Amino acid sequence: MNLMITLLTNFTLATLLVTIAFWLPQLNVYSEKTSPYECGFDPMGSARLPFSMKFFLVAITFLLFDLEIALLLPLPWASQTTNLNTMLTMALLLIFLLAVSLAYEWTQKGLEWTE
Amino acid sequence: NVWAKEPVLVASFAIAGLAVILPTLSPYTKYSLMINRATPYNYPVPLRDDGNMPDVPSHPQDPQGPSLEWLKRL
Amino acid sequence: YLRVLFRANDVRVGTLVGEDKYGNKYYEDNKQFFGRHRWVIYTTEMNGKNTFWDVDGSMVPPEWHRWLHCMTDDP
Amino acid sequence: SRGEYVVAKLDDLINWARRSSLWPMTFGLACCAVEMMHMAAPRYDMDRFGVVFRASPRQSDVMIVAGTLTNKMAPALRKVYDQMPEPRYVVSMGSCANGGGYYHYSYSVVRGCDRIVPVDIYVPGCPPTAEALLYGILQLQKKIKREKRLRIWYRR
Amino acid sequence: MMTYIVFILSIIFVMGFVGFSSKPSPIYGGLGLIVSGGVGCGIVLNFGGSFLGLMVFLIYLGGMMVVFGYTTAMATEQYPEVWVSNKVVLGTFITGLLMEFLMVYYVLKDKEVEIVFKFNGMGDWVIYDTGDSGFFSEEAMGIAALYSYGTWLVIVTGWSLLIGVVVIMEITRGN
Amino acid sequence: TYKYVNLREPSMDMKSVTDRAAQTLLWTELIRGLGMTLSYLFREPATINYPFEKGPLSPRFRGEHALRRYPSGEERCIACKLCEAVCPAQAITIEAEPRADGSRRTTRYDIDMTKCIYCGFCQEACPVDAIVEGPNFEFSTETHEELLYNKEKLLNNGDKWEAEIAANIQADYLYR
Amino acid sequence: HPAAHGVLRLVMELSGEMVRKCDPHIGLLHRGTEKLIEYKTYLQALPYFDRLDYVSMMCNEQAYSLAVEKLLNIQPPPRAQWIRVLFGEITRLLNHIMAVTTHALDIGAMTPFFWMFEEREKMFEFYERVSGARMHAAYVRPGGVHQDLPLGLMDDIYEFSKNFSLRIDELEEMLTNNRIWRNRTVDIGVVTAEDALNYGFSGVMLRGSGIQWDL
Amino acid sequence: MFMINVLTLIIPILLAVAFLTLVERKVLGYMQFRKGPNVVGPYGLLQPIADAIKLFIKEPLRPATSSISMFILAPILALTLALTMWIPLPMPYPLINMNLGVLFMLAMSSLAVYSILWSGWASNSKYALIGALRAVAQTISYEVTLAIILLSVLLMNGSFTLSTLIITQEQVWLIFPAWPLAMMWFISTLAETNRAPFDLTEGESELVSGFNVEYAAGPFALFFMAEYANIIMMNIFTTTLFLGAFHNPYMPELYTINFTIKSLLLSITFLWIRASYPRFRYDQLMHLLWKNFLPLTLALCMWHVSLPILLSSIPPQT
Amino acid sequence: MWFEVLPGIAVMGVCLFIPGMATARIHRFSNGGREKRVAHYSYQWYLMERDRRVSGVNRYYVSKGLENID
Ligand code: SF4
Ligand code: SF4
Ligand code: SF4
């Protein structure tokens, strides 16, 4: 809870920056500043319109390679046991499987479209 | 030729291939196995008196049992 | 020195061409490039407006205005 | 007079903090924009005075209207102007902007930008020189030197 | 003063996670999910977990970033609703909150609650480790498995992930 | 004569391809770009400090729109209206009157500084060099009314300096 | 918008970060110059051809003065021809360096802007010393160049040409076979030379795409 | 006294950010053949202090449909998490002696990305949407490669504990057993730190500040300070993670001086890379990142797995 | 040259200096002069626990130096 103490002090610092932004300097005359600005002209609607995106495979690609990051990240505790053979073998097999999946979707233009 | 189709990629395949090949011919996997076997994390227990085992010695000062000396000795 | 240390930046007195009424000082050098030949130091309260701070352009008389915008070669 | 002395000190402080930077927006319609770009020259700096290009209008300190305002442009000009931090200043740069100039007649020209926004600091020229533009920014800073905001607020 | 701190962090987790699963707009749901994942990492960390909570914080949180990318890309309403906008959304959120406060009430002023099991009301410094002189640090050696003893398991897991990659590519390719 | 560019095949020598591969791996001419950035880093800047070190100009510079008068004499203008006839934005507004003695002079002399486009056509057309483009540039106004000038404003503006304008004309009279 | 060099309203009706259509709406900077020159005379309306293109301050003056001379059957003296060609190439240099500079600003490339605008400050000092103008020098009357150059110009043109050859070599050192500027902009903007003829393109477009054509 | 150590961590980062803004403007000026802020105050300094006051004054104010909770909670979590990154950093003895620090670094960096994300969604004017999805794409790219390169450089010597890492940095710096891995990681830190538009597509001139299109004039300071704390943050983490100095034993001042000098000259190198190169491209970022870094990183990871079995350099891992 | 950029870097580097020296001063101020006994594993924590047990004032850094032999 000492890092929670640090989080508490930074929360109090951030809220005092909010209050010193809002309440101290001057007045608050609204009613045209609140209008949505794009580049000089009043546009149609707003955001939250259906915004069809370019990449489809790339976010799922990130997700699955983050999952193999999750399986690979205990490498230092891999490196200290009496079974060196299975250690090095399954480590090489996991990275080689990662490279195999990458090589498949690299050769099958899974990244060469709307990137 | 086979080098510079994608050159950093082929260099990566080369260091990958030597990483595959090279621990087969390795004169130090046995040293890694010995050192990793000979770091006790827990207590080396005693045992019942013996049936006159002429091994597993009476005092760990006595070099009857499995000692290690090759740490300082390269 | 705090005069010129917080006037702007300079320490480059050493040519000493002259001054003019309103007291203002004019220094011409040849050792620097074309653009810092002729520089000017503004005095204090030349017409009671406390012109140590908030210095104005055209607090100079016009003959030094022609001299200092690099239109002539002699003061 | 400890109260009014503290008010004078703090008002002088905040006015100095106002007149320090004055980062504008790069509005720049016509060739007075090119003159602004040559006020961004090494031979005449603006970052000596904290005049820093900040393209988004919702944090710029002043607005340098430069270039020929037209009727097709003027709603975009004011709908940029009306959303800004609450202190706001207008530097009208150039004879097109500050009284029409050469196109003072001739339809789809607003006859100077006075008909759209409040305009504090005029710098006239076709173009204004960059030296004259920086002098206009200095005299804007002296207008900031004579605010007496919090003095008026306390003696109210 | 506090000694129920894992129960407290679990109450904050249940608040953020009921507001998560009450289904507002999914960006507000992801706000709730990042709050819930952060305090759940805090629960398992302050319980005695060394790294695995910060690990799942990282992994699960990058997954939520991908979920944000798709909920922005695909379909939103003309105006997205928040927790306190609708009849049903506000009703489910406040009644989940009411279930939370009601179980806090019927634990803190009672002995036990037996809705599905006899739940003992007192914080979990019991039962707990009586200071084992380990130095092997259980979670470190625990994830130092999957590699010494874990032969078949990483085989089928990585094979499932490779099949997952070719499956995603061929589902989008199936046009 | 034409000199057309970007025509090469990449030379497939072993030395060429290993130099280009080392360029790909080490980002070599990227480091050469960094070297150019340091080479301009270790210079000295050619700025001017603004109020104290003013930028240079030219003798034919066109600023203030002042007026000259005669050597130990009166107003050099006649109201001959050539400056209105050549003023392209029609900023010159002149309504003359002969004075109380009979010689032809003015009443209403107006240079609309909001409309002036700083050519020098009134400097060319002025047959006595009465109107002269001034040397300096500080109008810099907090109001709109103070931009538009009149006869007494321009003559006070011409009484603030004469030998300035006489020096620039004596430098420039052979050319124009 | 700062990448919109000047002003150009652009209604891009796109699919997300990879477009469908774009429409350049221009006319926001409309000033009525043709109607004004209809209600003016020649010499009084020459600054419209100063101010129309606001980069080629001498080239369009050359264009309009040669238009009046080709209408009027008058040859100017050859010294004015040489000085006008000199300033045509000088303002051509200023226009090419503004093109490189605004492409640098539209692509990133923050510092060569500053380098070559120090050089263009030297260019503006030359225009000041010649015509007495900052950036809109009339200086080209129909009927030859009026109000010619003083003693003290050709020296600066000589020394500035040597310095400028050094500086354009330094710009080729910094950019121009840089890695990622090149990988940013090669594979884009291809227009077929048949359609580069029949979209009415001219000048640098017909330079870069195909045909050999110089006026 | 723990509150006093909290104060001596939260106070110097503010002066660090403010005079880093000064050194940005002045180094950028002397780079670009001009001169920086020289007139105002002592040479520049009290003008960044005046910038803090000036941006405090500007009275922040909300857009139309911008829901206020998410709105004002985005940059607060930005600056809070940008502070709480600096908890385990071993300036000689850190604040919380964490048994694991670098995975904590990755976690709070992802949270900084979420802060940029929530501000870009809640500002709600379609340009903040554009810039937010550009940020999402460059974070799809840059949390794989940086994390796996991290795993490589901690595999040989680190084991997650930065005190044992400063034990390891005695004989040779870790720049020599991994220099190309270090170069790829420096590129990734320059991308993920979201400065130096060599690898940044958020503060372009093609957009207008997609992270801050219309947030509010007040918390622009918060978001600004968060990104420059990101710069100092990853440069200090680079300066610790690779190289440094065998410190004066039980004596802190020599180590602190040498560490500060190395870290700040590396930050000047970072700024000097910003002052040099053109901006970048979306599809070129995906192509360049994956198809140039990623198999080379996998090859470095497998060779740094095999090297503790090729040369018996397994760590003495506690 | 770089003759004028050095004061900004130097002031901002003293700004980076003060967390390290301040933190070291607070650590040595907090525990009787002793550099802080960092506790990685539960073995070290149990050793620190019996250390703060045998002190009497429930502060481990006294460390009761070679005098309860009797
Ligand atoms: S005043 Fe002159 S320089 Fe400025 S925009 Fe108008 S025509 Fe261009
Ligand atoms: S051209 Fe000269 S003399 Fe004639 S009216 Fe104008 S100012 Fe007077
Ligand atoms: S310089 Fe041109 S616009 Fe100005 S008053 Fe003279 S002729 Fe008219």
Side-chain angles (χ1 to χ4, degrees):
Chain A
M1 58 89 203
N2 295 114
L3 63 93
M4 186 176 178
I5 286 166
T6 64
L7 186 69
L8 182 67
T9 58
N10 298 131
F11 183 76
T12 56
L13 189 144
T15 56
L16 68 87
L17 290 175
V18 162
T19 58
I20 201 167
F22 276 169
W23 294 105
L24 187 142
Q26 279 88 23
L27 43 83
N28 284 315
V29 174
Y30 288 110
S31 68
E32 196 173 4
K33 306 172 180 66
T34 189
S35 65
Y37 175 74
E38 288 184 353
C39 203
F41 290 94
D42 292 335
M44 57 92 72
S46 66
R48 287 78 183 264
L49 198 284
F51 182 71
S52 67
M53 275 305 292
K54 287 174 71 174
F55 61 94
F56 292 154
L57 292 172
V58 185
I60 307 299
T61 297
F62 173 75
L63 200 151
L64 300 179
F65 287 123
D66 197 1
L67 290 175
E68 288 182 355
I69 290 167
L71 266 77
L72 264 57
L73 62 89
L75 281 176
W77 292 279
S79 296
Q80 51 185 3
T81 191
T82 60
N83 293 319
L84 300 172
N85 51 4
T86 63
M87 187 198 301
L88 187 272
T89 303
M90 277 70 172
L92 289 182
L93 189 60
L94 260 295
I95 55 92
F96 181 73
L97 183 141
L98 198 152
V100 160
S101 63
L102 179 68
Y104 172 73
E105 63 94 17
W106 178 71
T107 54
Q108 296 297 319
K109 61 180 69 65
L111 297 175
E112 291 178 350
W113 180 253
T114 64
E115 311 183 354
Chain B
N1 53 5
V2 78
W3 177 262
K5 293 173 72 173
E6 294 181 356
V8 64
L9 280 307
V10 175
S12 68
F13 286 117
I15 184 73
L18 70 91
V20 170
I21 291 166
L22 197 62
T24 61
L25 53 100
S26 178
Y28 290 97
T29 56
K30 59 181 291 295
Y31 284 167
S32 297
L33 188 144
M34 287 300 294
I35 296 300
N36 202 0
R37 184 180 290 168
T39 58
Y41 289 3
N42 290 318
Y43 188 77
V45 72
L47 50 91
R48 178 57 59 186
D49 46 358
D50 273 331
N52 290 114
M53 294 290 289
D55 286 322
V56 60
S58 66
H59 194 195
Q61 183 58 254
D62 198 0
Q64 296 181 359
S67 177
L68 54 89
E69 292 181 353
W70 60 90
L71 267 298
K72 192 188 289 185
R73 294 189 299 164
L74 197 282
Chain C
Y1 179 74
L2 192 146
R3 180 184 292 272
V4 76
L5 182 60
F6 291 97
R7 187 177 291 276
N9 283 313
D10 290 331
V11 294
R12 289 191 299 272
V13 184
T15 173
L16 280 76
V17 169
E19 59 92 19
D20 196 359
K21 184 62 179 176
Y22 294 97
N24 51 2
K25 295 182 287 295
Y26 297 97
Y27 290 161
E28 179 180 3
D29 194 0
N30 202 5
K31 291 173 95 290
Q32 280 73 240
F33 62 95
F34 181 74
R36 291 181 184 176
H37 287 283
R38 300 171 175 89
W39 63 89
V40 57
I41 300 168
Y42 289 98
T43 57
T44 69
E45 295 179 355
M46 64 89 208
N47 199 358
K49 300 289 105 178
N50 207 163
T51 180
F52 183 76
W53 296 88
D54 66 1
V55 296
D56 281 325
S58 295
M59 284 183 179
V60 298
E63 63 271 15
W64 298 95
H65 177 272
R66 187 179 62 86
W67 181 71
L68 194 144
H69 283 281
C70 297
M71 297 180 185
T72 187
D73 54 354
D74 288 330
Chain D
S1 66
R2 64 182 68 249
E4 293 181 355
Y5 183 73
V6 167
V7 166
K9 287 173 70 176
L10 188 67
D11 198 359
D12 195 3
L13 172 66
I14 60 97
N15 287 321
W16 182 74
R18 288 181 191 275
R19 66 175 178 172
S20 71
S21 64
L22 292 175
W23 55 84
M25 65 185 299
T26 65
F27 187 72
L29 300 174
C31 28
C32 279
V34 182
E35 187 69 27
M36 287 180 66
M37 292 170 70
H38 288 284
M39 193 54 214
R43 291 176 66 247
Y44 299 102
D45 283 330
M46 293 181 289
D47 294 333
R48 295 188 293 115
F49 292 150
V51 177
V52 177
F53 284 168
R54 180 68 67 189
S56 62
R58 296 286 294 270
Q59 47 185 348
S60 296
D61 299 334
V62 302
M63 188 173 73
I64 299 170
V65 175
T68 302
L69 180 62
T70 66
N71 283 328
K72 186 173 171 67
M73 180 62 75
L77 177 61
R78 192 175 173 87
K79 291 175 185 178
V80 165
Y81 174 74
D82 296 336
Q83 43 194 351
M84 202 169 176
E86 293 182 353
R88 64 187 68 88
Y89 300 100
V90 170
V91 175
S92 184
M93 179 180 173
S95 62
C96 286
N98 61 6
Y102 200 58
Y103 309 99
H104 180 268
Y105 300 97
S106 74
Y107 68 98
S108 68
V109 177
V110 185
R111 276 80 177 176
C113 64
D114 291 330
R115 294 173 186 265
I116 299 299
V117 294
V119 176
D120 281 330
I121 298 301
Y122 296 95
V123 280
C126 178
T129 70
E131 189 173 2
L133 181 64
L134 193 57
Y135 185 71
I137 295 172
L138 264 65
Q139 192 165 359
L140 175 63
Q141 290 182 354
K142 294 178 182 180
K143 181 178 285 294
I144 305 301
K145 192 182 179 182
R146 288 187 298 273
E147 292 292 326
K148 63 180 72 175
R149 182 192 303 276
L150 196 65
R151 275 87 66 89
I152 292 297
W153 182 78
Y154 182 71
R155 75 179 66 252
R156 177 179 290 114
Chain E
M1 185 178 176
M2 59 89 208
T3 319
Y4 292 165
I5 195 65
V6 185
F7 178 76
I8 294 166
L9 289 173
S10 186
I11 289 300
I12 276 92
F13 173 70
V14 171
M15 291 194 289
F17 192 71
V18 170
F20 164 78
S21 65
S22 298
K23 288 182 175 180
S25 177
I27 298 169
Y28 295 103
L31 185 275
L33 187 55
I34 290 168
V35 172
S36 300
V39 299
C41 173
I43 291 164
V44 63
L45 181 67
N46 292 318
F47 187 78
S50 297
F51 68 100
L52 190 272
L54 212 288
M55 183 177 173
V56 66
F57 183 78
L58 188 65
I59 302 155
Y60 192 88
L61 187 133
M64 186 54 221
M65 189 180 293
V66 172
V67 176
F68 178 80
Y70 280 164
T71 193
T72 305
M74 295 305 168
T76 58
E77 292 290 328
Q78 289 184 355
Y79 61 98
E81 64 183 1
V82 196
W83 292 274
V84 284
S85 178
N86 197 359
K87 292 181 180 180
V88 181
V89 179
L90 179 144
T92 55
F93 179 73
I94 292 176
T95 51
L97 188 148
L98 193 275
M99 289 293 174
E100 293 162 353
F101 180 71
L102 198 277
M103 288 295 109
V104 171
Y105 185 77
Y106 280 172
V107 169
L108 192 65
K109 291 184 181 180
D110 291 329
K111 292 182 182 179
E112 66 183 4
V113 180
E114 295 182 356
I115 48 170
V116 60
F117 300 107
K118 293 185 179 180
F119 291 110
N120 295 318
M122 60 183 176
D124 55 352
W125 66 92
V126 289
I127 56 97
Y128 184 77
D129 190 5
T130 175
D132 286 332
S133 178
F135 194 76
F136 62 94
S137 298
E138 295 183 354
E139 286 183 350
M141 299 301 108
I143 209 161
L146 284 78
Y147 287 147
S148 64
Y149 293 159
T151 63
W152 180 259
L153 185 55
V154 292
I155 294 169
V156 297
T157 301
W159 183 258
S160 176
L161 265 293
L162 171 61
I163 294 305
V165 172
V166 66
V167 155
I168 300 307
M169 186 267 167
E170 292 296 326
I171 286 173
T172 65
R173 183 66 182 88
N175 299 116
Chain F
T1 59
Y2 59 93
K3 186 174 71 175
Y4 67 98
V5 293
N6 278 320
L7 187 143
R8 61 94 54 84
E9 64 270 15
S11 296
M12 289 299 293
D13 290 333
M14 189 69 74
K15 186 67 70 178
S16 177
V17 74
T18 190
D19 289 329
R20 291 179 289 113
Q23 183 173 2
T24 304
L25 268 74
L26 288 173
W27 293 269
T28 61
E29 288 190 355
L30 189 146
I31 303 301
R32 184 178 295 173
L34 266 299
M36 186 64 201
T37 63
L38 182 140
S39 69
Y40 277 5
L41 178 61
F42 293 173
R43 280 177 176 262
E44 292 188 356
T47 74
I48 58 97
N49 197 358
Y50 176 71
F52 296 159
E53 295 172 348
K54 292 182 182 180
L57 286 175
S58 178
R60 287 186 295 274
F61 187 77
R62 298 187 300 275
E64 188 72 28
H65 280 284
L67 284 167
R68 295 177 66 244
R69 69 180 66 249
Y70 278 157
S72 298
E74 62 182 1
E75 304 173 357
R76 190 177 289 274
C77 175
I78 289 96
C80 81
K81 297 185 178 68
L82 287 175
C83 55
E84 181 176 356
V86 305
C87 185
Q90 294 181 358
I92 298 298
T93 302
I94 293 176
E95 179 173 357
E97 281 181 355
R99 59 181 179 176
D101 290 330
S103 297
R104 62 174 299 164
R105 288 183 188 276
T106 64
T107 40
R108 189 173 67 244
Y109 189 82
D110 291 328
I111 300 173
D112 300 332
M113 296 303 294
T114 66
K115 292 180 176 65
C116 175
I117 201 181
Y118 299 95
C119 327
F121 295 127
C122 57
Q123 187 183 5
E124 290 184 353
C126 190
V128 293
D129 290 332
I131 181 170
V132 180
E133 306 295 326
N136 56 355
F137 38 88
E138 295 188 4
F139 298 145
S140 302
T141 312
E142 296 178 354
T143 57
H144 191 200
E145 291 177 352
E146 194 177 1
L147 297 175
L148 299 175
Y149 290 161
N150 292 116
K151 179 179 178 291
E152 287 179 352
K153 177 64 180 67
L154 292 177
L155 287 175
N156 284 319
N157 201 356
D159 291 336
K160 198 187 294 182
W161 57 84
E162 185 195 9
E164 173 76 30
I165 298 170
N168 291 118
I169 293 171
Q170 188 177 1
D172 286 329
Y173 71 100
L174 293 178
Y175 300 100
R176 68 176 176 86
Chain G
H1 190 87
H5 186 70
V7 288
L8 175 62
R9 187 171 183 263
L10 205 155
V11 177
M12 49 176 75
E13 293 182 355
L14 61 98
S15 62
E17 298 182 359
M18 185 67 199
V19 302
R20 294 295 176 188
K21 290 181 181 180
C22 63
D23 291 331
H25 294 282
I26 202 60
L28 286 82
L29 201 65
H30 184 271
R31 295 175 291 174
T33 62
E34 295 181 356
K35 194 67 172 293
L36 287 168
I37 301 166
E38 288 180 355
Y39 285 166
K40 286 183 175 66
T41 68
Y42 294 94
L43 182 60
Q44 295 175 358
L46 180 142
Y48 289 99
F49 287 146
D50 281 320
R51 269 75 177 174
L52 186 73
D53 185 4
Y54 52 90
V55 185
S56 60
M57 65 190 74
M58 297 297 293
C59 296
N60 311 121
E61 293 293 320
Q62 173 175 358
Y64 173 63
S65 66
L66 286 173
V68 173
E69 290 176 354
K70 187 178 175 70
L71 204 162
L72 191 58
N73 292 317
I74 292 174
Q75 181 184 2
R79 186 174 191 267
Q81 290 176 354
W82 283 103
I83 297 168
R84 184 178 295 169
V85 168
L86 174 64
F87 282 162
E89 292 294 328
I90 284 175
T91 318
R92 179 169 291 165
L93 188 65
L94 193 146
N95 196 0
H96 282 90
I97 197 57
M98 192 196 79
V100 171
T101 300
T102 190
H103 189 274
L105 289 181
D106 292 332
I107 207 166
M110 193 178 291
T111 184
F113 173 83
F114 292 94
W115 301 346
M116 305 313 293
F117 277 175
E118 199 275 332
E119 298 296 328
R120 188 173 167 186
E121 285 289 329
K122 296 175 74 176
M123 298 280 285
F124 286 164
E125 184 178 2
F126 290 164
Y127 282 106
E128 287 173 351
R129 189 176 295 111
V130 174
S131 69
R134 178 67 185 272
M135 197 183 293
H136 288 92
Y139 189 71
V140 184
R141 304 292 189 267
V145 174
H146 184 269
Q147 195 177 5
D148 60 344
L149 52 93
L151 190 145
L153 180 65
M154 294 179 70
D155 302 335
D156 287 331
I157 297 174
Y158 182 75
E159 302 293 328
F160 179 73
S161 66
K162 295 201 269 79
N163 285 313
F164 188 80
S165 178
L166 182 61
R167 291 290 158 84
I168 191 63
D169 288 332
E170 289 177 353
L171 184 60
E172 288 187 355
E173 179 69 25
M174 183 64 203
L175 200 140
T176 313
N177 307 321
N178 192 359
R179 177 181 175 88
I180 205 64
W181 191 81
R182 179 180 291 174
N183 199 3
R184 172 74 177 175
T185 51
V186 168
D187 295 328
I188 49 95
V190 286
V191 177
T192 65
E194 301 174 353
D195 292 333
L197 293 180
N198 286 322
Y199 282 113
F201 289 168
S202 294
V204 181
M205 290 298 294
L206 294 180
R207 295 296 187 274
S209 296
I211 197 66
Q212 300 180 359
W213 174 258
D214 192 3
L215 280 77
Chain H
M1 71 291 290
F2 181 73
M3 188 64 71
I4 304 171
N5 199 0
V6 170
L7 292 174
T8 61
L9 190 60
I10 62 100
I11 292 168
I13 188 166
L14 305 180
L15 282 302
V17 171
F19 294 105
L20 181 135
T21 60
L22 183 139
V23 171
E24 282 177 357
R25 192 174 297 116
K26 194 181 264 80
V27 169
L28 193 276
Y30 278 101
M31 168 57 211
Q32 289 171 354
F33 192 71
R34 63 177 177 85
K35 190 174 180 179
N38 54 0
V39 172
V40 288
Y43 288 161
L45 311 172
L46 224 292
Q47 199 191 17
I49 281 94
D51 286 331
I53 307 299
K54 176 70 163 175
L55 201 60
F56 284 162
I57 287 172
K58 295 290 175 60
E59 282 290 327
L61 45 90
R62 67 188 71 186
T65 170
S66 63
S67 64
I68 296 98
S69 177
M70 179 68 76
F71 187 80
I72 204 62
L73 265 296
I76 292 308
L77 293 176
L79 190 141
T80 301
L81 294 164
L83 202 284
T84 61
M85 187 78 84
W86 287 9
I87 299 172
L89 294 180
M91 292 76 70
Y93 303 101
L95 195 277
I96 295 301
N97 307 113
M98 293 182 74
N99 204 1
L100 47 104
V102 295
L103 212 152
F104 186 80
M105 296 295 103
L106 261 294
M108 301 299 107
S109 176
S110 186
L111 263 295
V113 173
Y114 278 115
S115 67
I116 302 167
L117 183 147
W118 284 340
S119 179
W121 177 254
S123 181
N124 197 4
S125 67
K126 186 71 174 293
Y127 280 180
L129 191 147
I130 293 297
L133 271 73
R134 298 296 290 266
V136 169
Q138 66 91 29
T139 310
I140 291 296
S141 298
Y142 282 92
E143 293 186 0
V144 173
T145 301
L146 195 147
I148 307 172
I149 291 173
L150 175 67
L151 182 63
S152 291
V153 296
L154 66 91
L155 174 58
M156 188 175 179
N157 294 319
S159 171
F160 285 172
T161 55
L162 279 304
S163 295
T164 58
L165 190 142
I166 205 65
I167 299 301
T168 59
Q169 289 179 353
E170 171 170 356
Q171 297 301 111
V172 292
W173 295 341
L174 195 55
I175 187 67
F176 286 159
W179 63 273
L181 189 64
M183 294 298 106
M184 307 307 167
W185 193 68
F186 183 77
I187 297 165
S188 295
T189 56
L190 187 142
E192 178 64 28
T193 309
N194 287 317
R195 197 74 194 280
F198 179 73
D199 284 325
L200 168 67
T201 60
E202 296 167 353
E204 290 181 351
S205 66
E206 294 186 352
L207 299 171
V208 186
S209 71
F211 46 81
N212 284 324
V213 185
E214 305 88 10
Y215 183 73
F220 288 156
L222 304 184
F223 198 84
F224 196 66
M225 187 182 288
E227 289 189 354
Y228 292 172
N230 188 354
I231 297 167
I232 306 172
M233 189 177 84
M234 287 293 174
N235 288 322
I236 285 172
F237 182 72
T238 305
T239 309
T240 300
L241 187 64
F242 285 158
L243 52 90
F246 177 70
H247 66 89
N248 195 355
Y250 61 85
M251 296 181 70
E253 294 187 356
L254 179 61
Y255 175 72
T256 306
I257 287 166
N258 198 358
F259 177 75
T260 299
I261 289 170
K262 285 180 171 65
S263 178
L264 268 308
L265 292 173
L266 195 145
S267 180
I268 300 304
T269 299
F270 187 82
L271 204 281
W272 177 48
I273 291 171
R274 183 185 68 84
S276 302
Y277 283 153
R279 292 179 186 274
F280 206 72
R281 186 171 172 84
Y282 189 76
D283 300 340
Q284 291 178 1
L285 183 62
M286 291 297 173
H287 176 76
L288 186 142
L289 184 272
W290 292 94
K291 304 172 188 171
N292 293 117
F293 291 91
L294 190 66
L296 187 59
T297 57
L298 294 173
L300 282 168
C301 291
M302 64 187 291
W303 187 47
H304 283 82
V305 169
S306 65
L307 191 66
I309 210 66
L310 287 171
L311 294 178
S312 294
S313 296
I314 54 173
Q317 183 165 2
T318 304
Chain I
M1 61 183 179
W2 63 91
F3 184 75
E4 295 182 355
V5 73
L6 294 177
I9 300 171
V11 170
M12 191 263 286
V14 175
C15 292
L16 265 301
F17 176 74
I18 196 67
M21 186 269 286
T23 305
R25 185 180 178 182
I26 292 170
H27 284 296
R28 289 183 63 188
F29 182 77
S30 178
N31 292 321
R34 296 296 181 188
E35 172 181 355
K36 182 172 73 173
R37 298 293 308 273
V38 291
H40 285 170
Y41 284 168
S42 178
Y43 179 77
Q44 292 175 355
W45 180 254
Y46 180 67
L47 184 141
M48 181 178 174
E49 183 180 359
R50 62 102 56 217
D51 197 0
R52 63 182 291 164
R53 184 176 294 114
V54 298
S55 178
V57 200
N58 210 166
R59 289 179 181 178
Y60 64 97
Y61 61 92
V62 177
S63 72
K64 198 177 181 183
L66 198 63
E67 285 174 349
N68 208 164
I69 305 299
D70 293 330

